[PDB]
Design an enzyme around this catalytic site. Structure first.
Site, short mmCIF file in Angstrom:
data_model
loop_
_atom_site.label_atom_id
_atom_site.label_comp_id
_atom_site.label_asym_id
_atom_site.label_seq_id
_atom_site.Cartn_x
_atom_site.Cartn_y
_atom_site.Cartn_z
CG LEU A 1 8.18 -7.70 46.71
CD1 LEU A 1 9.64 -7.35 46.55
CD2 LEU A 1 7.55 -6.80 47.74
CG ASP A 2 1.70 -6.01 41.28
OD1 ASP A 2 1.28 -7.04 40.75
OD2 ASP A 2 1.51 -4.91 40.73
CD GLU B 1 3.27 -9.95 38.49
OE1 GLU B 1 2.63 -10.34 37.49
OE2 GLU B 1 3.30 -8.75 38.82
CG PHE C 1 4.52 -24.41 34.76
CD1 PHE C 1 5.01 -25.67 34.41
CD2 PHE C 1 3.30 -24.30 35.43
CE1 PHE C 1 4.28 -26.81 34.72
CE2 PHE C 1 2.58 -25.45 35.76
CZ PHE C 1 3.07 -26.73 35.40
CG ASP D 1 -2.45 -10.43 36.75
OD1 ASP D 1 -3.32 -9.53 36.79
OD2 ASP D 1 -1.28 -10.19 37.11
O1 LIG Z 1 2.27 -9.21 33.82
C1 LIG Z 1 3.30 -10.01 33.24
C2 LIG Z 1 3.21 -10.15 31.71
O2 LIG Z 1 3.56 -8.92 31.11
C3 LIG Z 1 3.43 -9.03 29.71
O3 LIG Z 1 3.25 -7.75 29.03
C4 LIG Z 1 4.54 -9.87 29.09
O4 LIG Z 1 4.27 -10.02 27.71
C5 LIG Z 1 4.58 -11.25 29.73
O5 LIG Z 1 5.90 -11.78 29.60
C6 LIG Z 1 4.10 -11.31 31.19
O6 LIG Z 1 3.41 -12.54 31.32
#
Ligand SMILES: OC[C@H]1O[C@@H](O)[C@H](O)[C@@H](O)[C@@H]1O
Ligand SMILES: OC[C@H]1O[C@H](O[C@H]2O[C@H](CO)[C@@H](O)[C@H](O)[C@H]2O)[C@H](O)[C@@H](O)[C@@H]1O
Ligand SMILES: OC[C@H]1O[C@H](O)[C@H](O)[C@@H](O)[C@@H]1O
Ligand SMILES: [Mg+2]
EC number: 3.2.1.141
Length: 580
Positions: free
Chosen positions: A261-262, A295, A317, A387
């Site tokens: 789940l995004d 996610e 991590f 990402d």
């Molecule tokens: O997409 C997820 C990301 O969102 C970001 O804006 C946050 O700073 C971070 O905690 C996370 O890695």
């Protein structure tokens, strides 16, 4: 006594009828005054049932083309099962009963047995289709991964994209293949004993091709927004069912083994039963072994222990590892020191932020919650994903960032693939692929121009709308046969074989895992009834002999795997060794 809210009798969209009687068309609208279905070019007025529900049965079968006509406006079906002419076109009626599945002896995969391999169908092969991807399944099986994680497949506009602009969630994106081509890929994976997971996006719809508001503005709310539009209103049961019905489609009808789940923090819902909980209830009702992953950046164990999801993609991590290797500090990387002592802590705790202040400028708050309730498989770890490559200006991979050596890259693989947390690899990672993974899109008109402009302003940066940006992200398979690509691939094969075969690495309990450091050397120790293993990773710039590393226990003597294949227990800069 949970009862699914879904009954095939009342399914929205176009559903084949039993006994060869045709197709039942159904829709919900809160505002239309006239409602018709246009099938193979012919308009037919639909029957009003009350509650905004409209229905009609016609003797057309699978393959018929249709859309709905609301107050005279031809409008695509949001519940379309396939959109051969894209998101503004007619849908095709699909019968899920026709495909000849051969996977009756496949029974899913447990999270603790997953090693994920993230695939973007468009770039994974030259063809960029399911059929071409299916041809790489024997490669993936022999590599030693166990679950493919497919990036989103819901139809979006244009001829390429990552998938996060999906707009017709039930319609697999036509350029990748037809419905039966997707089924063929899943069936082939299952025959090789590989699981297949799908990335789904239930926090927003893409900017082009989402016609839900044409039927009922109340699918959405103005209370909050998404990146693209009005927020998805999970107080509205038809909105809830749009996504739970979608999750059930992918699992039941396409035989996926799980969903990722995004952006779950952005699924806003103040209902008594949160939509995440109901998603878990609805997929479980299917009576299989399907998994749900979130996610989620909040470091919130309730996703598992209250919403009853199976695990969480946990970036601390990843981030601690990247900062260790590059020293970068922009954006969220400012949240991390990196280094052996930092990595040991983050591994010990599963995630770093358990309620402490997150001091990143523009984002300041007390971030996270105690991780104690979560067990090793509940954390999904990686050192690369779509990402963390693609959201960089040039889309470069970890070994391609300034300051990172291939030795460090190989040590990072040994750390990831010997931990009891659930690992994920990004396509091509295993051979230190030479190609970037850049952000690409193919939107029309002003929207396309806006995307290009937005990317330029945000951060020369490759134009997401350029064909070249998509092509530059294509995997080059031939390169894996030579040089350092082949050397890296041999190491990935060796690590995945150890993970599978080593009786101590089978550990999946944080109780049996300890970590620490001596200077720039990280150590990670596993002790079970089967024995002891210690991973040592030299994150320093110098050479360190294993015998000179200060440890609170006696180091095991037998060298099981050295990341540069050395015979002696010594670690050049960036190198790692597993001993037992
Ligand atoms: O997409 C997820 C990301 O969102 C970001 O804006 C946050 O700073 C971070 O905690 C996370 O890695
Ligand atoms: O060299 C100046 C920086 O030193 C530290 O950062 C380095 O050491 C970290 C481990 O303590 C590594 O994770 C990191 O990659 C290195 O850049 C310090 O943390 C920085 O603030 C200094 O600018
Ligand atoms: O407009 C009538 C109703 O349509 C539906 O039944 C929606 O689920 C409901 O929330 C709305 O009030
Ligand atoms: Mg020391």
């Amino acid at each position: 006594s949970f009862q699914t809210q879904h009954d095939p009798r009342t399914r929205l969209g176009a559903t084949p009828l039993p006994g060869g009687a045709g197709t039942r068309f159904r829709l919900w609208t809160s505002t239309a005054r006239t409602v018709a279905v246009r099938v193979n070019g012919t308009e037919h007025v639909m029957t009003s049932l009350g509650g905004g529900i409209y229905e009609l049965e016609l003797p057309v079968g699978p393959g018929a083309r249709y859309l709905f006509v609301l107050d005279g406006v031809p409008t695509p079906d949001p519940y379309a099962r396939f959109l051969p002419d894209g998101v503004h076109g007619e849908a095709e009626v699909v019968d899920f009963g026709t495909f000849d599945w051969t996977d009756a002896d496949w029974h899913g995969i447990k999270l603790a047995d997953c090693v994920f391999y993230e695939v973007h169908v468009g770039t994974f092969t030259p063809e960029g289709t399911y059929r071409a991807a299916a041809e790489k399944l024997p490669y993936l099986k022999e590599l030693g991964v166990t679950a493919i994680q497919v990036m989103p497949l819901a139809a979006f506009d244009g001829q390429r994209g990552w998938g996060y602009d999906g707009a017709a969630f039930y319609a697999p994106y036509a350029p990748y293949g037809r419905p039966e081509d997707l089924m063929a890929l899943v069936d082939a994976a299952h025959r090789l004993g590989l699981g297949v997971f799908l990335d789904v996006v239930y926090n927003h719809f893409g900017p082009s091709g989402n016609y839900l508001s044409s039927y009922a503005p109340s699918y959405f709310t103005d209370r909050f927004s998404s990146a693209w539009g009005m927020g998805l209103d999970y107080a509205e049961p038809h909105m809830r069912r749009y996504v739970t019905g979608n999750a059930r489609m992918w699992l039941r009808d396409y035989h996926f083994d799980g969903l990722r789940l995004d952006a779950t923090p952005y699924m806003t819902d103040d209902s008594e039963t949160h939509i995440l909980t109901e998603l878990a209830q609805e997929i479980h009702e299917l009576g299989g072994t399907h998994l749900l992953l979130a996610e989620d950046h909040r470091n919130l164990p309730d996703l598992v222990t209250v919403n009853h999801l199976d695990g969480i993609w946990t970036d601390d991590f990843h981030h601690e590892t990247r900062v260790t290797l590059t020293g970068e500090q922009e954006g969220y990387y400012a949240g991390y020191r990196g280094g052996a002592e930092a990595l040991a802590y983050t591994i010990r705790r599963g995630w770093r932020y358990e309620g402490q202040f997150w001091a990143v400028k523009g984002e300041e708050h007390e971030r996270g919650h105690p991780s104690d309730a979560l067990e090793a498989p509940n954390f999904v770890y990686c050192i690369q994903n779509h990402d963390q490559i693609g959201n960089r200006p040039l889309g470069e991979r970890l070994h391609q960032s300034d300051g990172v050596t291939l030795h460090e890259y190989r040590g990072a693989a040994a750390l990831l693939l010997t931990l009891p947390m659930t690992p994920l690899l990004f396509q091509g990672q295993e051979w230190a692929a030479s190609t970037p993974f850049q952000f690409f899109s193919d939107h029309a008109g002003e929207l396309g121009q806006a995307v290009s402009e937005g990317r330029k302003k945000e951060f020369d940066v490759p134009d997401p709308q350029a064909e070249q940006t998509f092509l530059n992200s294509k995997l080059n398979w031939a390169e894996r046969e030579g040089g350092e690509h082949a050397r890296t691939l041999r190491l990935y094969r060796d690590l995945l074989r150890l993970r599978r075969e080593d009786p101590v690495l089978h550990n999946r309990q944080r109780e049996n895992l300890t970590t620490g450091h001596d200077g720039d050397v990280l150590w990670v120790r596993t002790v079970t009834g089967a024995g002891e293993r210690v991973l040592l990773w030299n994150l320093g710039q110098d050479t360190r002999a294993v015998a000179e590393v200060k440890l609170p226990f006696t180091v095991p003597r037998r060298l099981l795997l050295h990341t540069e294949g050395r015979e002696d227990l010594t670690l050049g800069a960036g190198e790692a060794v597993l001993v037992g």
